[PDB]
């Protein structure tokens, strides 16, 4: 459950991603695939090489989904219902993998937004990503 301060921090911090959405999302995926190679099993027919246009394209989708989540942070299950059906019902992604991607997203933000990534904002972003992860791993239709 997010506090009012959490929501404020997340909106402010993610708001700085802007046009770098695709870039940061792609970097986060690349970090995950490299650091935790078991995650590649969910993408059997992807080009997952360094600098892959397909990963770049996917990174933008993930980032834009996170932008969607921020714009609906008080009512996320209804806003992300399609993404939950994809990840929980169709793909059956093990919940551990969401912790891995969430960590790689935080590493990416820490590497690119040093001023923004304070301990308080770090804490809020971690809670936010855990909340998104819970929605995406739940079946609630």
């Amino acid at each position: 459950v997010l506090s009012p301060a959490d929501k404020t921090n997340v909106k402010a911090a993610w708001g700085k991603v802007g046009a770098h959405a695709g870039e940061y999302g792609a970097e986060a995926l690349e970090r995950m695939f490299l650091s935790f190679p078991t995650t590649k099993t969910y993408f059997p027919h992807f080009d997952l090489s360094h600098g892959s246009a397909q990963v770049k394209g996917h990174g933008k989708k993930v980032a834009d989904a996170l932008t969607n989540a921020v714009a609906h942070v008080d009512d996320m299950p209804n806003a992300l219902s399609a993404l939950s059906d994809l990840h929980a019902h169709k793909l059956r992604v093990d919940p551990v993998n969401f912790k891995l991607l969430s960590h790689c997203l935080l590493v990416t933000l820490a590497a690119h937004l040093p001023a923004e990534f304070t301990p308080a904002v770090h804490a809020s972003l971690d809670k936010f990503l855990a909340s998104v992860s819970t929605v995406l791993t739940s079946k609630y239709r």
Partner: protein
Amino acid sequence: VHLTPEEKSAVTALWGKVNVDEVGGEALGRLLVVYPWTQRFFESFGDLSTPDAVMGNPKVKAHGKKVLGAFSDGLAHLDNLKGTFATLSELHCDKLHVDPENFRLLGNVLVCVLAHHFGKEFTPPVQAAYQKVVAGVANALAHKYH
């Protein structure tokens, strides 16, 4: 932990630039802020009531130094983490009863702190090598549970 010579060189080179006096305290402090239940293990440390109090707490900074030194001891002998961490494992597991998920959390907070400090130099391959190290350290700390 099995690092390639290339990975070991990358990790060692970066670690040589890590501030011995501060980075451990930053990681421990962030653990206490981001995962607040961990504060329960540090009652004697004084004021942990706000993020600023935590990050400025002298005992957190001091303790963080020790924590970093233990990671440093791990890097010096990657082929014997279990041996290196045996006493610390007895302490954290048998005495303190820290749930081992928290070992993973601290390792990952340290990785975030390195990324924060080094920016673009903390490349995905460098991170991948560090993830092997912190997984190895967490496993070694948890050995008395296994």
